[PDB]
Design a protein around this motif. Sequence first.
Motif, PDB file in Angstrom:
ATOM      1  N   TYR A 146      37.682  52.846  93.267  1.00 25.27           N
ATOM      2  CA  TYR A 146      36.913  51.611  93.329  1.00 25.27           C
ATOM      3  C   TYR A 146      35.868  51.586  92.210  1.00 25.27           C
ATOM      4  O   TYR A 146      35.752  50.595  91.487  1.00 25.27           O
ATOM      5  CB  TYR A 146      36.211  51.485  94.685  1.00 25.27           C
ATOM      6  CG  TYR A 146      35.410  50.209  94.858  1.00 25.27           C
ATOM      7  CD1 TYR A 146      34.331  49.918  94.024  1.00 25.27           C
ATOM      8  CD2 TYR A 146      35.715  49.305  95.882  1.00 25.27           C
ATOM      9  CE1 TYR A 146      33.570  48.768  94.202  1.00 25.27           C
ATOM     10  CE2 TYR A 146      34.964  48.150  96.072  1.00 25.27           C
ATOM     11  CZ  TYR A 146      33.892  47.890  95.230  1.00 25.27           C
ATOM     12  OH  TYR A 146      33.119  46.775  95.429  1.00 25.27           O
TER      13      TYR A 146
ATOM     14  N   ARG B  84      33.456  45.130 100.026  1.00 22.73           N
ATOM     15  CA  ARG B  84      33.756  43.877  99.340  1.00 22.73           C
ATOM     16  C   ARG B  84      34.392  44.243  98.004  1.00 22.73           C
ATOM     17  O   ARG B  84      33.942  45.168  97.335  1.00 22.73           O
ATOM     18  CB  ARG B  84      32.475  43.079  99.093  1.00 22.73           C
ATOM     19  CG  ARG B  84      31.573  42.937 100.309  1.00 22.73           C
ATOM     20  CD  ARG B  84      32.276  42.242 101.467  1.00 22.73           C
ATOM     21  NE  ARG B  84      32.855  40.955 101.084  1.00 22.73           N
ATOM     22  CZ  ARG B  84      32.182  39.969 100.497  1.00 22.73           C
ATOM     23  NH1 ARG B  84      30.893  40.114 100.213  1.00 22.73           N
ATOM     24  NH2 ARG B  84      32.799  38.832 100.202  1.00 22.73           N
ATOM     25  N   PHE B  85      35.427  43.515  97.606  1.00 21.53           N
ATOM     26  CA  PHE B  85      36.110  43.813  96.358  1.00 21.53           C
ATOM     27  C   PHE B  85      35.890  42.774  95.271  1.00 21.53           C
ATOM     28  O   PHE B  85      35.865  41.579  95.549  1.00 21.53           O
ATOM     29  CB  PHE B  85      37.609  43.948  96.611  1.00 21.53           C
ATOM     30  CG  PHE B  85      37.961  45.015  97.605  1.00 21.53           C
ATOM     31  CD1 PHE B  85      37.700  46.352  97.329  1.00 21.53           C
ATOM     32  CD2 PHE B  85      38.574  44.684  98.812  1.00 21.53           C
ATOM     33  CE1 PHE B  85      38.046  47.347  98.235  1.00 21.53           C
ATOM     34  CE2 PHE B  85      38.925  45.677  99.729  1.00 21.53           C
ATOM     35  CZ  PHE B  85      38.661  47.010  99.438  1.00 21.53           C
TER      36      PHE B  85
ATOM     37  N   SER C 113      36.478  40.096  92.398  1.00 26.01           N
ATOM     38  CA  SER C 113      37.531  39.096  92.402  1.00 26.01           C
ATOM     39  C   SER C 113      38.693  39.508  91.506  1.00 26.01           C
ATOM     40  O   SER C 113      39.824  39.046  91.694  1.00 26.01           O
ATOM     41  CB  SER C 113      36.972  37.741  91.954  1.00 26.01           C
ATOM     42  OG  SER C 113      36.467  37.809  90.633  1.00 26.01           O
TER      43      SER C 113
ATOM     44  N   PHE D 136      40.071  42.499  91.320  1.00 23.85           N
ATOM     45  CA  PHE D 136      40.902  43.564  91.880  1.00 23.85           C
ATOM     46  C   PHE D 136      42.257  42.988  92.277  1.00 23.85           C
ATOM     47  O   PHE D 136      42.317  41.969  92.969  1.00 23.85           O
ATOM     48  CB  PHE D 136      40.232  44.171  93.112  1.00 23.85           C
ATOM     49  CG  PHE D 136      39.347  45.349  92.810  1.00 23.85           C
ATOM     50  CD1 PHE D 136      38.757  45.498  91.560  1.00 23.85           C
ATOM     51  CD2 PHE D 136      39.081  46.297  93.792  1.00 23.85           C
ATOM     52  CE1 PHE D 136      37.915  46.575  91.290  1.00 23.85           C
ATOM     53  CE2 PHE D 136      38.235  47.381  93.532  1.00 23.85           C
ATOM     54  CZ  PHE D 136      37.653  47.516  92.278  1.00 23.85           C
TER      55      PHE D 136
ATOM     56  N   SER E 208      45.792  42.544  94.247  1.00 21.59           N
ATOM     57  CA  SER E 208      45.992  42.577  95.685  1.00 21.59           C
ATOM     58  C   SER E 208      46.426  43.964  96.128  1.00 21.59           C
ATOM     59  O   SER E 208      46.016  44.432  97.188  1.00 21.59           O
ATOM     60  CB  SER E 208      47.023  41.528  96.115  1.00 21.59           C
ATOM     61  OG  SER E 208      48.291  41.784  95.540  1.00 21.59           O
TER      62      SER E 208
ATOM     63  N   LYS F  94      43.426  46.390  96.245  1.00 22.78           N
ATOM     64  CA  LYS F  94      42.633  46.197  97.451  1.00 22.78           C
ATOM     65  C   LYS F  94      43.315  46.848  98.657  1.00 22.78           C
ATOM     66  O   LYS F  94      42.661  47.465  99.490  1.00 22.78           O
ATOM     67  CB  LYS F  94      42.424  44.703  97.724  1.00 22.78           C
ATOM     68  CG  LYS F  94      41.600  43.951  96.681  1.00 22.78           C
ATOM     69  CD  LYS F  94      41.335  42.520  97.163  1.00 22.78           C
ATOM     70  CE  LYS F  94      40.334  41.771  96.288  1.00 22.78           C
ATOM     71  NZ  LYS F  94      40.872  41.406  94.941  1.00 22.78           N
ATOM     72  N   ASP F  95      44.633  46.712  98.740  1.00 23.48           N
ATOM     73  CA  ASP F  95      45.391  47.283  99.843  1.00 23.48           C
ATOM     74  C   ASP F  95      45.308  48.810  99.864  1.00 23.48           C
ATOM     75  O   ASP F  95      45.209  49.420 100.923  1.00 23.48           O
ATOM     76  CB  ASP F  95      46.855  46.845  99.756  1.00 23.48           C
ATOM     77  CG  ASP F  95      47.691  47.388 100.897  1.00 23.48           C
ATOM     78  OD1 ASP F  95      47.407  47.046 102.063  1.00 23.48           O
ATOM     79  OD2 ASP F  95      48.630  48.160 100.629  1.00 23.48           O
TER      80      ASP F  95
ATOM     81  N   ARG G  32      41.679  49.721 101.066  1.00 21.12           N
ATOM     82  CA  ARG G  32      41.387  49.441 102.470  1.00 21.12           C
ATOM     83  C   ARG G  32      41.881  50.641 103.271  1.00 21.12           C
ATOM     84  O   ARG G  32      41.241  51.078 104.230  1.00 21.12           O
ATOM     85  CB  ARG G  32      42.122  48.180 102.950  1.00 21.12           C
ATOM     86  CG  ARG G  32      41.730  46.870 102.259  1.00 21.12           C
ATOM     87  CD  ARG G  32      42.668  45.730 102.689  1.00 21.12           C
ATOM     88  NE  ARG G  32      42.516  44.527 101.871  1.00 21.12           N
ATOM     89  CZ  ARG G  32      41.434  43.753 101.866  1.00 21.12           C
ATOM     90  NH1 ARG G  32      40.398  44.049 102.643  1.00 21.12           N
ATOM     91  NH2 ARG G  32      41.383  42.686 101.078  1.00 21.12           N
TER      92      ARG G  32
END
Lengths: 336, 20
Positions: A215, A242-243, A245, A247, A249, A252-253, A256
């Motif tokens: 991150y 919070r990621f 904008s 990043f 998809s 982000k997965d 998480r």
Amino acid sequence: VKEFLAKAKEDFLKKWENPAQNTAHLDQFERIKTLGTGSFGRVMLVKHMETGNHYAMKILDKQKVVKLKQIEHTLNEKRILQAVNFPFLVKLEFSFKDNSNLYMVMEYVPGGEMFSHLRRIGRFSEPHARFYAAQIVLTFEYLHSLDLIYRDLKPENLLIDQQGYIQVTDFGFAKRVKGRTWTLCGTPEYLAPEIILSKGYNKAVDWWALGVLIYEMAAGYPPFFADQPIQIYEKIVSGKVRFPSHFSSDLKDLLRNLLQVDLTKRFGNLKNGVNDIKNHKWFATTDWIAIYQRKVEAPFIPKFKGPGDTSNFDDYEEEEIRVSINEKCGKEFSEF
Amino acid sequence: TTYADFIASGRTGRRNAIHD
Ligand SMILES: N[C@H](COc1cncc(C2=NCC3=NN=CC3=C2)c1)CC1=C2C=CCC=C2N=C1
């Protein structure tokens, strides 16, 4: 792989069981410059007069190691370091001690810290970040297979070599453990929730730190930051991230899953171990075999001007090395 | 922006490890 690790465990165990000791002397090295400074010691660029090689010499003040109660941790570090061997782990070349200090001489990584390059550049693109993350994934798979927990992942501890590859450093919190451990240690921004909540933790804290690293590398800042640790701890355990904008998809997965407060759903700690990480979409373009062999094109190549160059490291106040006429903590460090 | 808040925070330097 499982074949590779099998042979790796065999080599580690032999050294682990019979660690090397006093393999050099202080006066065989030329003290050149300080590369880093800590609470109980410092690291200096050094030159081996017999070979003409440059090395990073870590000098630890025995009395300070004792005052800070880091004796066992220091014994862990040297014992583990002299027994491991991976392309992304810095090599311990020599170790010895005198009346006042403990000494660990390792390979010098001229490229400097990822930290420096990260802050200067701001943030790394996803392909760049992924390149380094891959190396940490294999390093942890390697270390974890040896029942080792690293416990101090962060940009400050990852160096860039000439080929642009990572070299993990600082094994002061490394420990060989089967089962749970409770030592509270690491760095605020990177501490897993289990650690902050004092509830016995395992190798899963390393996979959480990886999520923090990825991150930070991709966003330019960590997912949990504030001026004081307690504030940071509050964010970490909240289980809220919070990621940016930008990043992807998939990115982000992956995060998480890595930044999962529930360490029974946290990637890397599941039934399928590290594969749940390696087979992740964000890693689809990654060729794990190519990375381990260093045959992949490095996104960034820190260049320098010959050996002994330290321009990729900050400047630190120098301090003469002193050795008392009397031995200082004999019994505490007898096995070093 | 988060970047601005980070750059203005006191945590942009080398972060020291904790233990005791
Ligand atoms: N964070 C800084 C750097 O800390 C390192 C710790 N251990 C190994 C290293 C290297 N190992 C190998 C290698 N090669 N080239 C440079 C190079 C460096 C750096 C300062 C700091 C300390 C320094 C001394 C003792 C304990 C400390 N805690 C923090």
